[PDB]
Design the sequence.
């Protein structure tokens, strides 16, 4: 149908806008602390602590499969990256501090993305 295609064009544009957002959020992590999944070889107990791991490369795979239906789902995953880190790592660690800075700096990007998603529809 013509509707399904129009629907698909919107998802492709949402995917387009979320890819730009992801790139901007990932620039806020120049140390690449959140780039890849926490290694289960190097942190074998990780899943005893963190039930839903997340990282930027895993978000990118979902993104490129057009697996985010709306900005809310995308934000859920970004928030997991941050909140998982802040639980597993103590306050006085480079990891916890990197998450705080990513949260704070990502807020600005995400604030405008919401306006752009509502605005463009």
Sequence:
């Amino acid at each position: 149908s013509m509707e399904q295609v129009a629907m698909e064009l919107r998802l492709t544009e949402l995917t387009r806008l979320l890819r730009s957002v992801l790139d901007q959020l990932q620039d806020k992590d120049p140390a690449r602390i959140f780039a890849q999944p926490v290694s289960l070889k190097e942190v074998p107990d990780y899943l005893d602590h963190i039930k839903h791991p997340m990282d930027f490369a895993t978000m990118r795979k979902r993104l490129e499969a057009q697996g985010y239906k709306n900005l809310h789902e995308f934000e859920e995953d970004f928030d997991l990256i941050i909140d998982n880190c802040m639980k597993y790592n103590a306050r006085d660690t480079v990891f916890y501090r990197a998450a705080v800075r990513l949260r704070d700096q990502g807020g600005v990007v995400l604030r405008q993305a919401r306006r752009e998603v509502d605005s463009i529809g």
Remarks:
- Residues 15 and 66 are 6 Å apart (CA to CA).
- Helices lie at 2-27, 46-49, 56-64, 71-88, 94-120.
- The chain has one domain: 1-121.
